[PDB]
Amino acid sequence: VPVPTGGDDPTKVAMLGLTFDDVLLLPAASDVVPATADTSSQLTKRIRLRVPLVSSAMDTVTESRMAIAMARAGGMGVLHRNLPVAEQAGQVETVKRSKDSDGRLLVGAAVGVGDDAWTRAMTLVDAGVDVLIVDTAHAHNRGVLDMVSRLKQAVGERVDVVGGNVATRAAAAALVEAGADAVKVGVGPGSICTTRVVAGVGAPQITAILEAVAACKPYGVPVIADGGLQYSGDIAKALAAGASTAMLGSLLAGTAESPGELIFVNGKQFKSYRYFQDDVLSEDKLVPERVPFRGPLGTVIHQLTGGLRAAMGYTGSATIEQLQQAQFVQITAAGLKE
Amino acid sequence: VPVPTGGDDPTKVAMLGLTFDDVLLLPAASDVVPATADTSSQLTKRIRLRVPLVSSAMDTVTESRMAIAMARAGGMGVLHRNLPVAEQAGQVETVKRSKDSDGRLLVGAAVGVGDDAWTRAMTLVDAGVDVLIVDTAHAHNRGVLDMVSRLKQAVGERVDVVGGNVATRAAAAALVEAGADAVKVGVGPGSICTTRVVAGVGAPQITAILEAVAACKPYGVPVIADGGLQYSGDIAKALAAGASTAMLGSLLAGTAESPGELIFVNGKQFKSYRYFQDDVLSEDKLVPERVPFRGPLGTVIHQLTGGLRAAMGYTGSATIEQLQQAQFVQITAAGLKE
Amino acid sequence: VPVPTGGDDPTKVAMLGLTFDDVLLLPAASDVVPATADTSSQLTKRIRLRVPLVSSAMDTVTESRMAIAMARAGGMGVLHRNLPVAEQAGQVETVKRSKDSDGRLLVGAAVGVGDDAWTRAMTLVDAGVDVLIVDTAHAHNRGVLDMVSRLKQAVGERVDVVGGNVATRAAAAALVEAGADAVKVGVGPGSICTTRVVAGVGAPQITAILEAVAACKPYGVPVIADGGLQYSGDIAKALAAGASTAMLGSLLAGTAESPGELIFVNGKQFKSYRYFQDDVLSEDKLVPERVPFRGPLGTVIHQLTGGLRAAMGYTGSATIEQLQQAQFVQITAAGLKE
Amino acid sequence: VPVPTGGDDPTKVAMLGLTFDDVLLLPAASDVVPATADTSSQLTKRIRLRVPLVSSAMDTVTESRMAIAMARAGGMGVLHRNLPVAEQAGQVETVKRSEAGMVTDPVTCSPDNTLAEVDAMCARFRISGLPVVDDTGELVGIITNRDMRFEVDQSKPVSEVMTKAPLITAKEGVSAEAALGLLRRHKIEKLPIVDGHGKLTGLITVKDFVKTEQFPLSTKDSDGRLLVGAAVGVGDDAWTRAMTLVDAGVDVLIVDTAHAHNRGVLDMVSRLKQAVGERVDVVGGNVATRAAAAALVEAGADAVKVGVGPGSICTTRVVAGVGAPQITAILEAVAACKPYGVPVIADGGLQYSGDIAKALAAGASTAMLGSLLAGTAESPGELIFVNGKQFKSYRYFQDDVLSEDKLVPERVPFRGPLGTVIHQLTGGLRAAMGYTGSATIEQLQQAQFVQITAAGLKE
Amino acid sequence: VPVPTGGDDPTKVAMLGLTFDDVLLLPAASDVVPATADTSSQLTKRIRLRVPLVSSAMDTVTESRMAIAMARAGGMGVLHRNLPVAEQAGQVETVKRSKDSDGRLLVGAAVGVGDDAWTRAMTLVDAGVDVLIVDTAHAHNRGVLDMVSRLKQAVGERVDVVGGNVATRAAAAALVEAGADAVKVGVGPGSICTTRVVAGVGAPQITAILEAVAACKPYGVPVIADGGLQYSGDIAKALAAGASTAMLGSLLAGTAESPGELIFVNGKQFKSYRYFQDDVLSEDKLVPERVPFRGPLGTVIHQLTGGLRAAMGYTGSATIEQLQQAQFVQITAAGLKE
């Protein structure tokens, strides 16, 4: 009668979470050449990218240079918000003035929650931003939903609103009901993540994507998988799990197009570089208190796209929409043994 | 027809035991700001702590200085019994004379089993102790239950009695029947624990807490999770599994407030410091035959409480009683790989 | 409709095998003191040992000195058969002439299969051996069963016949039907075992013990667990899984009483020391082609017995027969992480 | 309502994949002595090997030398295709003429050839003599070691130094005893055998029997020549290569692709089966599912090769996120192939001989040996000595779009003689057969597994 | 009577060679600020450099880009000769067309020995080279001396001729007699040098510089110290030992201005890139058969010049000619112990 893992509530342990290392893509009937596979996918309800990759809105990853490079590569970049409002609008305009209906490069920008966030969002919309991402560590919060709904009513006709990071079906459904044009998924997805170690909170990314897609797919809301990626195979797995686009963080932190200046210390090359880190539950609030150079962004994007095209050829997926129907095989611990 | 793991008895392998590394807290709908979360919790049926942390009754962890520091920090300390009765009463008197209804600092003390244990307990009650903990390696023994019942009849009106370490539902129910005001839970909870290696005996802490809470929650008896803690996330997980307080042992062993004198050896700082170790089945009876300095207690308590508050914010738990209703996701082996 | 692990045969993967590290002994209601716990157990149908430990019949573990020491320690030893028949009979006589009904020390000897094995067995029986072990790598063989039956018919009135190593219920049942006085269990029980790597053959020892006990318990035939032990906790787990005695191998190879001479090489102490290795499927046939000193036997035996007594105190087992009814908790991979 | 691993689709996570390290072979009732066990197994429907081991068609593993050594050991080798069609056909011809037997049609050179060419031919075919025939096929001479041992000018034409006709020759169908009598009487070592006109037909020497004594386990056709296989791709260049290999006398054609569940691979298999099915056997490329194996069987493949990302740290898994654990893949493919009698070749994922035993017990009929053979002496490459260790030292034809080299942006250690590795693998297999009571490989395919946990793998 | 180190010949061990690590510069009376120190020095009899640094003529160090950078930095570069004559002439033209009396950048080029070397030299002089270096591993050879004499007679009025690597006073005197405008010093100068290990040939660099200066200083012939340099302090020591310029080899191999393309492999950055290596006794003839990135040349040059200026300040040397009069202190083995 009692639960095999202890207690009496069978829902106390709600689910078994699978990560990227837990699953592999099963080969299927294929007439798809990797070179001829269409990797385009929807970022939001109204925006389609040639390459389903978006740079994360992290101070160490995306500012104007990275946003321009990502837009030229066929993806997009979200400008980080650890800077003043006027500076963010200036970076938005730097990206725009350098594709949309008018032929200018697409760009996204991150905003928080609050009246200061409202002013920031209005200024960014004035500067010509295309995507507003209400970015929070935990989006299953009434304030985040209120901000998403308010932005959707105010500037929904001209810009797309993306909701904060969720990890469950209920949170994704709440964001969809708030009117979000895309749902960003992932709450402590890394295995050694600071959220997992310090707060004990996390969700393995494959299960989180599956649940959020179960919430969002009926309403046509794209899913952006954010965090937990280590290799291009993880990009393929995230897209096959149901996500429409992937967000790239630490994989792009040390690239040349990312912020920071090149320095040479101890024989190795590095990139050397608060009132705006207003987000509670963020990893910087958990810690008690030099990112290496990674080369040009083009090589990293080429490697990731090559891995994705290889997966598409193996699974017989002509489009990303077909790759989202691919099947997984769950591997055991011996499958991770070197 | 036969059991898949061998034999014919399906109850031979009773359960799959989960440890802290097996589970993560699932994010849920939240309106809780981490700073405004109420971390107050019940130590016993009549005692509520501002911070649900109790320093373990270990010779290397808690004496008068540590007890005073823990009571001032909002938690409590239990004085170890690896010393003469007069010395323990003196430490109790030191803690009291430096909060109860009188306004003196709250303090607990560990007692054993036997006539000498009765003498020790009566002396400690005379000295003004608030909590008596019958601290045994294996509390599911008739002697421990009889001692708990005797203390409850004798001095139960003025002090609280907490039963020793249990790991199963039946043992916790037996302790509740004997009249224990709180149940301490954990028997070989660490992975590389000496009890697990030398004796082959142990119980994973999450499952043990779930079973003990299933036994204790209907009667309103608090559960103290003792052992297996490595990070503040483990504190959050233990409280979410249903425990009311977490007992801190080796994490406080090298703190400045812990016993021992500070010494400087080989450029590193350590702390340098039987007839009273009368408990059989204790880990010292299993071994054939220098604790590093860990800084001030305040920093450790602050970090642990910050992790707890972050978990409460992620789970939407305004109180510890709400955190006790939080759900878990079970992660695979791949989720622990670096 | 197909099996989740592949194919359409649900019995292709017969079972999930558990090893010692997969399980722990659960605590239970206990009035047992480790010092007053009775560790006696049946070695065979007619032989009871004070300490349930038998030194393995390995060339590097047991000859006359080790057999004498084991008999004096309360257990027994089995003399290895990697030597001439007259020499083995001389070792038997050396052990006997230094307990049975006549006051001489009990001793066992290993024999193979064949006519030379029959001559060896008759010589050993004439020398006064008490137990004959028909030691084979794979006892589920018609020749081994015939040898066991022949020995039981010929000399079963005076000496006990123990069957070779088995790993399944069917093999143990075949040995029992052949008249074995005890059944030795374990076939590639170690994780990095040569049989597992080279032949791909093995059986996790806890599951193997459970299956062989399911075969042997209804007929009162004791089970000797051989191999896979690393710690005294493994002794406790094996005896709780249903085995009556544990056979000690590598744990005794480098003891002072074990064969070989003491040498001092590179600052460390070591021991320095075929036509008679006629057994097929033995590990020495699978390999392409200095055992350290381990101290006195008494220390090892004392430590193992202390661990066993601690387990008996935790489980509330006054006797080994009561320990054989104890329950297990299965632990996850995270339970093994250091 | 929801799936325990997430979502609402119960088939999204189709299965739990078991690798070799997940399973052990359970001992069973056994009267099998390891030495007396029969390790013979079917490579294809018509071909049976004495040892169920095939060398992988890898450029670092199998060339003519490796193919000859594998055939002599009782297995077989598949020649890699990362080289021109002419070179691969030449390797096929080298393997076929290593142990010709029967007719033993002797390699012949024209009188217009040179000493360098005949030295190259002698090195190629491991022979010490060549008959010399004219444009019409009539004999004009013979060249041997005694004719050119110290000759200085390698440009010397064959006609200049050959032993001039007439020579000591016999007629077609001459008895073996008569040939031995001629060889003893004239003390010539290589006796030509001529037709009824004057055109050379054969050459008689007992050494072909002697080599039969040397390697009693050699796998051969009815003609007495060593069996050999060759890999082909898909396309028109692949069709030309396959026709050239069939002309050279190849025995097995393997449509070698990383992903055989593809209409091109199936069409190539069907075309080869229709065109040259009576002469050679066609083996389908790598599959990892029951449906792909069923498609290959429907295409007419004589054997199905199984494995797609089988290794744990395989490049395909890391870069593409694609793979299938090998034990589950073999079980799934055998579930489709066994009802039709189609053998399964397990390719990839092997690290120890126990894995070979497990792969055969899972239902596969042969194991294909790859990286375990890459560094052996019989493998292509030249030995070099660097530091304190010995290593092996040494695209247009890498046309597979899903091959791992397309994923990787970019020394091979020495492993000793092939015979030692083959002996160790066979010993492990025989021990497994003894433990499981399997007298034959077909009985071993019925053996049961026990699944082990993570704790069973910890050192 | 006999030699204390063996034998009867007292000149069998000719000298005790001092390396850079053997000596330190003694501080002296100083009115010299490092900022105002004049580091200009004579490269040859007729060429003066602002910074006494010459880039080594190795295939991995100096071609047109490195030569241009070195000329702009105040030093000079020598073009390597592991390439066809036309290509080296093209590189000379690239350097010249991008300082001499006509305002073009100065550049030097290495030549070998033989008739093809003469053709190469004539082509290079036609292309407008300023310095010809007859670069050989062992310049105390009649062929090198004859080549130097022929070049001096032919094109001595327009270009400066530098002799190959010597290590003794006699070799330097022979080069001066032959008409070398500068003498390059060093033969197996490194401690782990291939020439020393394979051939047993070498000369510690401080002693070699002192002897060559003893040969060259009365004739006003500058000395170029080539090889053995590890730090800027070694540059200061070499200049103080009497050398006029220092040739930089492996220190400049991985710099951006050096030949090769940048590649990023395994998280680290490297530079990736015979009939023309005709010189016998070169280290490629002795070896049986990726250079890391080192940052911009400017950082290396700035650091080396800063160290040189610090030494000039410590010794009170207003000019390099005054630094050439500085004194050394010999240090023991304990002075090298970390």
Ligand SMILES: Nc1ncnc2c1ncn2[C@@H]1O[C@H](COP(=O)(O)OP(=O)(O)OP(=O)(O)O)[C@@H](O)[C@H]1O
């Ligand atoms: N031209 C050929 N074509 C095919 N097979 C050949 C040819 N020449 C020889 N063989 C085969 O290979 C074997 C090689 O022996 P061959 O006589 O050429 O060598 P050998 O060095 O003269 O031998 P030995 O001196 O030891 O008798 C022959 O006995 C025959 O079986």
Ligand SMILES: Nc1ncnc2c1ncn2[C@@H]1O[C@H](COP(=O)(O)OP(=O)(O)OP(=O)(O)O)[C@@H](O)[C@H]1O
């Ligand atoms: N059938 C033959 N009839 C006549 N002469 C022959 C015949 N075969 C070979 N010869 C000649 O006899 C001589 C020796 O040839 P033979 O075949 O004995 O040498 P081989 O096999 O190379 O022997 P070895 O191993 O001693 O070098 C040569 O001059 C050769 O041309």
Ligand SMILES: [Mg+2]
């Ligand atoms: Mg010969």
Ligand SMILES: [Mg+2]
């Ligand atoms: Mg011969």
